[PDB]
Write a protein that binds this ligand. Structure first.
Ligand SMILES: COC(=O)c1c(O)cc(O)c(Cl)c1CCc1nccn1Cc1ccccc1
Length: 210
């Protein structure tokens, strides 16, 4: 009743996504692919301005697990997003407590966003664009809320996708499962992709997978 349109969009996107790919791991491929497109965008801007990477001279994809908090982080130093981009997000999500340009948004980012809800219950976006403030955005595919980050500009430039995982999909947080999965969907990415892994007396560091 409250979110009839949102639930129907969620039902249709899940139905079509599950039918087309049949592999629930498509969420990780989208996270890798979308991060690559953001990195490619800012690298293209670099070829015309000398100091377009001043906020962050690296162009990486860094994936980190949090088995205790049940979190999955995929951080890239791509182009990032302004606050107005986060407000539009995909046009199908209503602003919190308030109950085509959006159809073109679903075309480009619908599969990437709604596939995350095959393994997650909430998606949190932390982004920083060159000409704007760092913001935190969250949604449950029904409502959304955007916030100015109290930590300030900690990303320098780029985006962090945080998925709070379902209890059924807690296996994606182990090291050997997330490392083998990233390796599969990385042979077509022209950017280094690191995974926070442990080495042995045990220290943690960025391990590059491609
Ligand atoms: C799902 O996460 C992403 O789509 C995603 C990502 O995974 C890595 C990234 O570096 C970036 Cl920028 C995005 C955002 C890509 C975007 N640009 C413009 C619009 N939207 C879609 C959108 C998705 C969610 C919130 C706001 C915008």
């Amino acid at each position: 009743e409250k979110f009839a349109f949102q639930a129907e969009v969620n039902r249709m996107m899940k139905l079509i996504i599950n039918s087309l790919y049949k592999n629930k791991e498509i969420f990780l491929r989208e996270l890798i692919s979308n991060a690559s497109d953001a990195l490619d965008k800012i690298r293209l801007i670099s070829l015309t301005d000398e100091n377009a990477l001043a906020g962050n001279e690296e162009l990486t994809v860094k994936i980190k697990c949090d088995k205790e908090k049940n979190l999955l982080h995929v951080t890239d130093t791509g182009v990032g997003m302004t606050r107005e981009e986060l407000v539009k997000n995909l046009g199908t999500i209503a602003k919190s407590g308030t109950s085509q340009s959006t159809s073109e948004l679903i075309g480009q980012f619908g599969v990437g966003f709604y596939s995350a809800f095959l393994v997650a219950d909430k998606v949190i976006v932390t982004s920083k664009h060159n000409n704007d403030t760092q913001h935190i955005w969250e949604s449950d595919s029904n409502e959304f809320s955007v916030i100015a980050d109290p930590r300030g500009n900690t990303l320098g430039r780029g985006t962090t996708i945080t998925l709070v995982l379902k209890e059924e999909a807690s296996d994606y947080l182990e090291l050997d499962t997330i490392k083998n999965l990233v390796k599969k969907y990385s042979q077509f990415i022209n950017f280094p992709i690191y995974v926070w892994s442990s080495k042995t007396k045990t220290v943690w560091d960025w391990e590059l997978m491609n």
